[PDB]
Amino acid sequence: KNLGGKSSGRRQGIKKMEGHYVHAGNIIATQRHFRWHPGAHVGVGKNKCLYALEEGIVRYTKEVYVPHPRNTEAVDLITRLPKGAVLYKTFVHVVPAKPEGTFKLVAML
Amino acid sequence: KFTRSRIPEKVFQASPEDHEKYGGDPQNPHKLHIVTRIKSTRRRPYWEKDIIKMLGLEKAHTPQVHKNIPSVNAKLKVVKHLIRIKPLKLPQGLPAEENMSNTCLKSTGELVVQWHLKPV
Amino acid sequence: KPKLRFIERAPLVPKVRREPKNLSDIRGPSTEATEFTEGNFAILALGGGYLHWGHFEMMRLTINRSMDPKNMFAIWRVPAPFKPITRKSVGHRMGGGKGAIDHYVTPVKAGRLVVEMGGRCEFEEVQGFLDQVAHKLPFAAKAVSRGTLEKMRKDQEERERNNQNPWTFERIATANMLGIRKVLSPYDLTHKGKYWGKFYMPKRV
Amino acid sequence: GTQRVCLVHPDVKWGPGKSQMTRAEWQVAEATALVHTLDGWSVVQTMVVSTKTPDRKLIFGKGNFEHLTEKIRGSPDITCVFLNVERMAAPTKKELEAAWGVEVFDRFTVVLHIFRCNARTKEARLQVALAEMPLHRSNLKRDVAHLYRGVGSRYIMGSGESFMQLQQRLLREKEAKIRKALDRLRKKRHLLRRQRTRREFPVISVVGYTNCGKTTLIKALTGDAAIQPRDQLFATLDVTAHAGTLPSRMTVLYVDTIGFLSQLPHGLIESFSATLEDVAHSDLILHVRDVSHPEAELQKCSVLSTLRGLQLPAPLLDSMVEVHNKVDLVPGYSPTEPNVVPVSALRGHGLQELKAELDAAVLKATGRQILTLRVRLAGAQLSWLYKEATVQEVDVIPEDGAADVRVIISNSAYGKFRKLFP
RNA sequence: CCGAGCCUGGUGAUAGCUGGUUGUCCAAGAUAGAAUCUUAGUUCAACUUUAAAUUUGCCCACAGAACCCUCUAAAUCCCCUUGUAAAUUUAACUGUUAGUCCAAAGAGGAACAGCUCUUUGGACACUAGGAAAAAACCUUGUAGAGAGAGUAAAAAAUUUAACACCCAUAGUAGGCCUAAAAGCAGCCACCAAUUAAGAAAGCGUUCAAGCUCAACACAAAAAUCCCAAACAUAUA
């Protein structure tokens, strides 16, 4: 009577924990829902996977959640929240390590 | 499921009664442990086997000297049910290069630096 | 309505989804209905087990017949059977899917009160039939007053305080001395050796 | 278990089975009462269907059978079907079950199921097990199909008996064990009867159709309170004796009995003979008649046939005192046959007349003599007469220090008295 | 010796199936799964072996890894130090991919199975000692000789049921109910006298009568034949 349910595990979750050096483009975490939200220098794919937009150190923090004003469901949640309440979410940041570049003496004209 | 055991911290907080019983002052703690494997690693988890090998306690009843520092203590906490830990005592102080060849570890845990094998 | 209320065989809205036999609901100390409420006497469960509609009927009939309605009142401290137990057809080989829902039970954990009685009466007037019911219950049970329950709890505390044994199950299990956690269960770190399956050892300290 | 049932009543219109005493509406009402008694489910739908030929693998002619198949399979609420027939053969049951995609029950199975559900005493459980043995033997095919597992004639080892045949053997031994147990039960009940028989308690067995108010009448006569009549059918499922006094200050044991239904296999009721033999060992039989019920005559026929099958002594069959209960429901009822007492147990209307009539019947049937006897006071004869016979009036002769006592005394007690106090 | 003869030949047919597979010695060596006309097999992975290159491998401090869900576990991941000496990569391969019990979290079954199915760990498929004999429980493992020595685990404990003695008048057969129901068939009331006694808690009387009481006072049983012998007292 019970058919299906044979799907395998998605192997989703965190691929880079805090303190891990991460190069640009590396996938930090794969998730089905928004468990960890994108922080600074962390981009979201179509499938909610978080990838490092810069080369640096991954840091997980708890930050206040301010949804985009056009995100109707989140805006309604906020509109129903009691005064003084603040939502928090776990964000993943990539603290860039290297500088954008250096000025080098190329020619002594 | 059987898993690695997290020993609560309060277990390793000695009391004045323990100090009186075992003869160790909380101030001025001993520097080195003498550790002897008194239990087989067989029928114990692979992690305990590996910790024993790390500590170099493969042979039973063979004393080994270890630092009394937090990391070594963590390993000893992991494998504490297989070993006997005693404080290394140095009645004549640390052996010197001159007497390095005349030392002996008496069963009391004292590293005597003169071993004459003669009656007192 | 002092007399004990009737308990239905199964919930009016029968459950449709078969669910596993999570024996943890019987295992361990009871965390609910552990204290008296609007009553002075009760049946305390000194062990875990499942109560069927047959047990409920036994309790109801015995207590209703033996009580004095004008001076005593009784009240259930355990919900009506809700957990569905499924049985396969007799002589069926293993496999082929989970069996159909056969009966409904209500779990009971050690230390819980099954029925609670009160009114213008003392213990001796009630302890008789309460002990009858407790003895006929599927788990170890005892007719206990508020005073007797407090006395037994205080006696357990006194034994725990004054035991001369340097070694306690709690200490050894928590410290993992001798590596006995290889032989113990994670539940034992909280049961402290007083519980073994559905059985509660009261003399155990 | 919570099984909505569709009632199917085959109405026989010609030839055998064309009942001349009952109507399809009344039979449907009785079947509905049976299922309501069984409790937990109800008649979702009812269908009375004509049947010129009632004996077939498919009880109905092909056309009506297909019509019923369409209706039953198009009605999804139906969970089971109750066919108002005495007994249906295994072929008919299998074919109807396959055609209608439901479970089929006949009156035999319904009565059996209510017995199994509301049987409390171990004696009742054993007797209903005996009554079930026929249903078992009929249903082994379906019951042990899954155990059979489609294996036959290929295994060459073990007891040569096939799966079906060795199941028949096991059921034979099971029935033998049940019959032995009922024989032991009969012996034990004889032990129980011994004492009351020795004390010569007049015993009146109250029999009749089911839900005639037998239990209510016994309650009214005895004055008891623990006796609980029920609206359901087959309420009284155990034979018990209750003491009640008559106007002559005589104690009599009313024996309550199982109810009787029409159109049932005889073996069903006859399996309770182990406990219904108390009627055979009775002194009078009181037949209760729910005259209000439209099927009173059919119920009469059914109960008389059931007693004849139970093999009660012919002298006991004769002298059966008939009481017409539920007269209040039939206002202005006028009894027609003689030696019939109209009574209303709930309202307790004719109970005094019934008590007097059955007192006279007991005097006639128990060999008891109402006579005046002269005894000497202080000689313990008066106390002995009180204890061993029912005294009715004590007229004391002070001059002689004696007394004339009007006593209803049995011959045994009279002989004991004449010998003890010459 | 015919479900299709016999002989020869193709023919050393083919067989994922069974059986067999012969000198000495040492060493490493039991390990997730996937697909498969596939679950009696095989290919890949994993594990294992060998050789080679290189540098980090294991243990692991904080900090860190989600709401749903009100609470909600043993833990895990990550991880510098530290104790350690292994690890990754390259090259070439086979063999194992038909598994048992024990502890623990569970699921199915019937909170049966020496049952079945996952997960964490152990042991066994290897040595030795113990639990009687003993794969899986406990002790212990790296190998030889010794007519030395200290130890490890390691021997079951229980024997259970006594309980008063004396005394009882009485408003009255309290009312009602009933033929009678007087403490005692049922309902209402349940006061009250004596120093002290229920308008009666049990027997009993058809009803009474009479007997007390509350009161004054002073664990086990099955089928060949039980199954070491025995022992309570000489210093841990």
Next chain:
RNA sequence: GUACCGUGCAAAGGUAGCAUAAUCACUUGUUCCUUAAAUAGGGACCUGUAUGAAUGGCUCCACGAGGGUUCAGCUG
């Protein structure tokens, strides 16, 4: 609807005959004879919705190392 009176459908609605059969099960069918006692045998049945007519049906003359039953005798 009350066997006969009409009716739907079909190619035709199983006719004669026999019938618990060597004939699914119910089955040891119900009865009478047979026996002290019969799940056997023989005779019958509103007996087959799974009998039935050259996939031959019923009847009975002889025959049979066929399968049942049986009187009397015979005998280890």
Next chain:
RNA sequence: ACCUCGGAGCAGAACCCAACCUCCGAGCAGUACAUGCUAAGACUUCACCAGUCAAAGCGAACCUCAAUUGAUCCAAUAACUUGACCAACGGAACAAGUUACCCUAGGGAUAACAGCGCAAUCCUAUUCUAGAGUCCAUAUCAACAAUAGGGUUUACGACCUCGAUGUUGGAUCAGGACAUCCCGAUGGUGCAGCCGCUAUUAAAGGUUCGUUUGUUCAACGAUUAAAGUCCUACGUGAUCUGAGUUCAGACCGGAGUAAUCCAGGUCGGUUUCUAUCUACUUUAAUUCCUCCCUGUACGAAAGGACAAGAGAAAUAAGG
């Protein structure tokens, strides 16, 4: 019944986890036509195949959805591209039945008998004091239940045995248990006596012959003191029989187009073994009945005893 894919529990917290386990769903739809081209770095359903995300850049503007699918070859096409509920979903390009006429290789990796584990089922004993027993729980029972025990049933498990552990009944001989059917002793009884019921103790001895039926059983007939319940590989086929069942032949009913088949019936149908080893091969009796007691005790009658005594037998053992 299922076979592929996804979500949620089992699997509470990195990942991963089985089940003919519990539940839900999918084999699309909608919008857009930059759902264009390129390219770092990463994830990866534990392999591979496949599947995912994506910075920067060019070119422009200023995808939703959990699943929503399928390789190669090969066909169609000028090309771009398209093609299978290949759903047995890693997919043979295209092939069903039946075999008891059967065969070979294996399997105790896997069933039937037996053993064994377990005790759901079955059986037994106590506790409970509701209810039967006129009153009265406990003379005899006993509901709801509780606690124990047994290993006779049907199972369930698949642990030994498939390079054979021969199978149901019957004959023969029986060994054992006692939870005793009879005989012995005793307590209770709703034990007046006779029959009885119940319990403790007792396993030395005994525990019938027949009609159908292959039957173990059951029914019936006649008896008996009784015609006990079980275990022993459902004791015992190298002691026996084969009536049933269970090969090859054939008929009836039914299924199928047929081969052939049936939880059906029915007639017939090969019972091997010279004993090597172990073991073994000469170890005070019960019961019924007759008379008398005695028509006594008992009892209202009906009926009707013990004990003591006498005599007879039957079986069993030995001659």
